[PDB]
């Protein structure tokens with residue numbers, strides 16, 4: 266009877282969640298917070314969208330949660346040891362807590378959308394954009410991960426890699442902009458532009474990762490970067506069998522040996538000219554804007 | 558010129574995605590597909606959702622359920638899920654995490670297809686939202702206790718609230734959606750008690766079937782363990798309290814060491830007996846529910 270009442274009380278109330286609990290399970294996330302330029306893009310874009318700063322704040326909050334959560338997970342998936350010159354959360358708090366916290370923040374983010382409007386028609390568009398771009402994000406990420414973890418099952422071509430980027434990187438970039446375009450109280454859609462900004466961003470990330478070495482973690486990962494994809498297809502094309510295989514073998518070692526990583530890079534520098542190709546590819550993309 | 562052409566085309570289109578791609582990413586989910594729908598069908602008798610809108614609800618629930626099992630096995634370092642090899646051991650942790658999270662959002666998208674009524678949608682999303690949030694909190698606490706042991710040893714109360722969040726999330730989600738779509742007293746209190754019977758029973762059966770008892774290997778703060786731990790602390794049984802902690806902290810597969818911890822629960826604290834009793838009472842709260850305060 267006393268137990269029965271304590272239970273009766275329980276099952277008839279909402280589940281209990283204290284602020285301490287909230288603090289406890291937010292450790293992996295608070296860690297990565299300690300790591301502005303994401304708001305510079307939002308403030309600029311806004312110069313054109315004209316959103317009241319009240320709503321722009323809630324937009325900035327949604328994107329950061331989604332962004333920081335993405336990084337918490339991408340690090341697990343990529344077995345990354347450092348993020349922004351700091352130990353990654355999964356190495357401190359563990360993979361289990363990090364996955365849960367990150368996925369949890371995805372839903373806190375989703376919850377904040379209610380705060381952008383009272384308008385039922387608008388709200389629905391918002392949730393849809395939120396849904397679509399998150400679905401796109403996971404698709405690209407699924408390919409980048411599949412290609413990597415199952416190499417050499419599939420050697421992506423420049424086209425396949427770019428579709429993957431349109432999904433993955435474009436995902437976050439389109440989410441931010443598409444949401445603002447729906448809240449804008451006010452020319453043409455800036456989506457095409459943000460997609461190009463996303464592609465340039467990703468290929469420059471892939472590129473600087475190797476040039477900054479020449480610590481090239483992307484090689485330790487086995488990632489099918491823009492430079493590696495060109496090297497692999499170039500090599501198959503010109504009949505360079507041993508080079509094509511050494512590239513695959515090195516990617517598959519998941520090595521942190523600096524000399525082995527340097528060898529690979531010099532292969533992309535003198536043998537396949539992938540570094541130059543990529544540099545040019547980036548410049549051309551930028552020129553497409555600068556010459557618009 | 559020609560490169561400019563292709564890029565232009567690319568950025569002016571939706572991201573490309575074929576079904577072959579869809580198949581790649583689904584592999585980890587398909588692997589886990591290889592009684593619940595009966596419970597949903599049964600519940601509809603009072604809800605009366607049109608066999609079709611009910612299929613969708615059913616699909617949403619299945620995506621979520623199956624997806625959380627894939628993530629939970631990664632978090633629990635489980636080598637087996639119903640006799641077969643767990644997905645992350647076959648497809649790796651990265652793809653499995655991603656495929657499971659992708660499915661969460663596919664589930665979130667099916668919600669838009671239950672209704673086209675603007676208020677009713679906002680209420681379905683809210684429900685979906687709230688329950689997924691409660692589910693992650695319960696899981697977060699469950700993992701936290703397990704991974705920070707012995708910083709915090711939960712009490713029966715703490716444990717049960719963790720269950721209301723975790724196990725209650727997936728049970729309530731299903732029920733609150735159905736009740737909201739119903740064309741026809743809430744059964745949420747009843748689903749809550751159910752979830753609790755189910756979880757305490759899950760923890761109970763895990764040890765009893767052995768008497769592989771993976772929960773021990775996992776180091777989990779299961780219901781019998783929570784009892785044992787607070788039972789020895791109360792009776793001041795120092796060694797035994799520490800011995801229980803020591804075994805959980807071993808993350809062992811040692812059949813012999815697992816046996817010992819169980820020996821402790823059976824002989825020293827009688828936690829297993831205490832739990833069998835607990836379950837029964839909860840059920841009687843339902844069995845002896847005359848006037849149907851909980852039952853329909």
Ligand SMILES: CC(C)=CCC/C(C)=C/CC(C/C=C(\C)CCC=C(C)C)(P(=O)(O)O)P(=O)(O)O
Nearest residue numbers: 303335336338339402403406433434437438470
């Ligand atoms: C977890 C899921 C589905 C997706 C996660 C996708 C992400 C963020 C991956 C992280 C990497 C690329 C960085 C990006 C895209 C930052 C974008 C910045 C904005 C300001 C939008 P990195 O590790 O940081 O180099 P990647 O090299 O692994 O491609």
Ligand SMILES: CC(C)=CCC/C(C)=C/CC(C/C=C(\C)CCC=C(C)C)(P(=O)(O)O)P(=O)(O)O
Nearest residue numbers: 593622625626628629633692693696727728759
């Ligand atoms: C991934 C996130 C946030 C939450 C996941 C929560 C889950 C599913 C945990 C799995 C376990 C409990 C079993 C359940 C819930 C049976 C399926 C439920 C139905 C309602 C049919 P188990 O491993 O199967 O014993 P647990 O013992 O680890 O608590």
Ligand SMILES: [Mg+2]
Nearest residue numbers: 339340343345
């Ligand atoms: Mg990465």
Ligand SMILES: [Mg+2]
Nearest residue numbers: 339342343409
């Ligand atoms: Mg990556």
Ligand SMILES: [Mg+2]
Nearest residue numbers: 629630633635
């Ligand atoms: Mg589990």
Ligand SMILES: [Mg+2]
Nearest residue numbers: 629632633699
């Ligand atoms: Mg678990």
